[PDB]
Amino acid sequence: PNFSGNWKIIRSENFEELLKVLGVNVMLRKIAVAAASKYAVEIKQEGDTFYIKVSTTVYTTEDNFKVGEEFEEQTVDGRPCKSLVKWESENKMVCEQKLLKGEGPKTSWTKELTNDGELIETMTADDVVCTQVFVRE
Ligand SMILES: *C/C=C(C)/C=C/C=C(C)/C=C/C1=C(C)CCCC1(C)C
């Protein structure tokens, strides 16, 4: 049992405050928080190669990477960035991002497989950490 599976969110904490740090106005933050209640993640892991598909009711993106190899994605607020994933431990990885253009808050994410079958994702902007918890569908 590795990261592979179809994961459905059961809990999201501090997501609105993450988007506030990132400059989203209140009305869209509330609509984004509602959209995150349908957040789903599909993972296929082969070694340190990861295929990820993150989706909501009306949107879906893919985001494939290999640990230790730089790649391009977008920050949570949508700005292009270059990213590098490393292991922290057997079942936790950390990704550091650097903006491709301009400046902005410092952003990163983590994924972790817990002993109790949960997937925990965090997303960070400066001081503020959002935590989302998933279970296998
Ligand atoms: C390893 C995990 C990854 C690459 C996931 C990143 C997640 C996002 C960029 C999520 C963004 C969201 C919005 C901007 C609006 C509300 C719904 C979300 C959670 C899909």
Please tell me the residue having the least CA distance from ligand 1 atom 5.
Answer: 54
Q: CATH no. for residue 134?
A: 2.40.128.20
Any ligand 1 atom below 6 A from CB of 111: yes
Any ligand 1 atom below 6 A from CB of 133: no
The domain containing residue 30 runs over which residues? 1-137
Instruction: Tell me phi and psi for residue 47, to 5 degrees.
Output: 70, -125
E strand segments, the chain: 5-13, 40-46, 49-55, 60-62, 65-66, 71-74, 80-89, 92-99, 107-113, 119-125, 128-136
**Resolution for this experimental structure (Å):** 2.0
Which atom, in ligand 1's list, is nearest to the CA of 12?
A: 19
Domains contained in the chain, number: 1
Please tell me the residue having the least CA distance from ligand 1 atom 10.
Answer: 76
| Separation between Cα atoms, residue 103 and residue 11, nearest integer Å | 31
Beta bridge partners of 98: 82
- Residues 79 and 99: beta-carbon distance below 8 Å: yes
Residue type, 42: E
37, 76, 110: which to mutate for ligand 1, most atoms within 8 A of CB? 76
Any ligand 1 atom below 6 A from CB of 121: yes
Instruction: Tell me phi and psi for residue 20, to 5 degrees.
Output: -65, -50
- What technique solved it? X-ray
